[PDB]
C-alpha cells in the first residue's frame, strides 16, 4: 500500500535482574516517530521525528500513561505465558506485538494488523476480517478466550478503521516534506577482479527513501536471480537506505550484464552497466 502506521511492543523477562523490560516504538512507513523504554531513568514517551514535536502536552501524557500501564500489563502477561507452557521461573522470555493500519494511494484503509509472538514464534493474530482470531496452539487458545470475553477484536476494529487511519493521515500531512517525499537512489557499478578469468560487478543504490527498492542483474536481458548476491537493505542513519547486488562474471563478458533499479523516487527505472 501507499502508507502505513505500526507500533512495535517488546516485553522481555530477565529473572534475577529486575522486572521485565517493556519497549514501544512507533513508525510511519520507514520513519520512526516515538519511543518508550521502561528501563529509562525517567520513563516517558519521547519524540523521534521532528514532525511529531508539535503535538501538545496531552498527547504526550496520554502516550506515557498508555505505555506505563502496558509495562505492568505485559509483566502479568509474561507470568501467564510462562504458566501456559509449564516453563520454569528461571528462563528469560519475550512477548512481541505489532499492530497498525495500511492505507492505499487514495488514503483509504487497505487492511489492519494485530499480531503477537512468544519467544519469536507466532502466537496469536487478528484475522484480516478484524473480527476473529488465529491461535497457534492450546496456550494461545486461552489468550483467545480472554480476548473474546474482553471484546478485544471489536476494540481493535474500531481503532484500526478509525483513530489509526485518522492519526496516520495527520502525521502524513504534518510530516509531508519527508514522509511524502521519495528520495531516489544514487547509483553506480563497480568492478573488482577475483581471478584472471572472473570479476565481481557490484551495483550500488545509496541515499534512497523509502526502503522499498528492486535491484537486479541481467545477462543478455535475462534476470540472474540465482547468481546474484543481494545484501539486506541497511539504514544510512540520516533516514535514507543503502543496498547493493553483485554478480561474478567472466572477464571480457561485462557488457552482457545490466543492473536494473526501480524505486519510487526515480522519474523512470534505471539500466546501468559497468563503465570502465
Amino acid at each position: 500500500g501507499s502508507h502505513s502506521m505500526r507500533y512495535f511492543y517488546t516485553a522481555m523477562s530477565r529473572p534475577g535482574r529486575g522486572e521485565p523490560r517493556f519497549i514501544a516504538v512507533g513508525y510511519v512507513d520507514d520513519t520512526q516517530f516515538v519511543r518508550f523504554d521502561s528501563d529509562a531513568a525517567s520513563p516517558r514517551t519521547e519524540p523521534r521525528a521532528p514532525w511529531i514535536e508539535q503535538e501538545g502536552p496531552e498527547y504526550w501524557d496520554r502516550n506515557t500513561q498508555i505505555f506505563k500501564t502496558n509495562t505492568q500489563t505485559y509483566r502479568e502477561s509474561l507470568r501467564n505465558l510462562r504458566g501456559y507452557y509449564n516453563q520454569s521461573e528461571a528462563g528469560s522470555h519475550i512477548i512481541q506485538r505489532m499492530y497498525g493500519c495500511d492505507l492505499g494511494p487514495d488514503g483509504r484503509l487497505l487492511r489492519g494488523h494485530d499480531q503477537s509472538a512468544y519467544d519469536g514464534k507466532d502466537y496469536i493474530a487478528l484475522n484480516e476480517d478484524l473480527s476473529s482470531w488465529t491461535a497457534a496452539d492450546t496456550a494461545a487458545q486461552i489468550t483467545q478466550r480472554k480476548w473474546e470475553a474482553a471484546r478485544v477484536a471489536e476494540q481493535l476494529r474500531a481503532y484500526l478503521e478509525g483513530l489509526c487511519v485518522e492519526w496516520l493521515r495527520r502525521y502524513l500531512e504534518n510530516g509531508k516534506e519527508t514522509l511524502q517525499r521519495a528520495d531516489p537512489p544514487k547509483t553506480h557499478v563497480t568492478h573488482h577482479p577475483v581471478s584472471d578469468h572472473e570479476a565481481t560487478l557490484r551495483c550500488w543504490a545509496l541515499g534512497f527513501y523509502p526502503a522499498e527498492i528492486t535491484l537486479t542483474w541481467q545477462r543478455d536481458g535475462e534476470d540472474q536471480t540465482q547468481d546474484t548476491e543481494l545484501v539486506e537493505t541497511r539504514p544510512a542513519g540520516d533516514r535514507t537506505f543503502q543496498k547493493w547486488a553483485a554478480v561474478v562474471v567472466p572477464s571480457g563478458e561485462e557488457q552482457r550484464y545490466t543492473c536494473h533499479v526501480q524505486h519510487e523516487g526515480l522519474p523512470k527505472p534505471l539500466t546501468l552497466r559497468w563503465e570502465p
Binding site: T73, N80, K146, W147, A149
Partner: peptide, 9 residues
C-alpha cells in the same frame, strides 16, 4: 497515536 491498553495475555 497508540490504541488504549488492551487486555493481557
Amino acid at each position: 497515536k497508540p490504541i488504549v491498553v488492551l487486555h493481557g495475555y
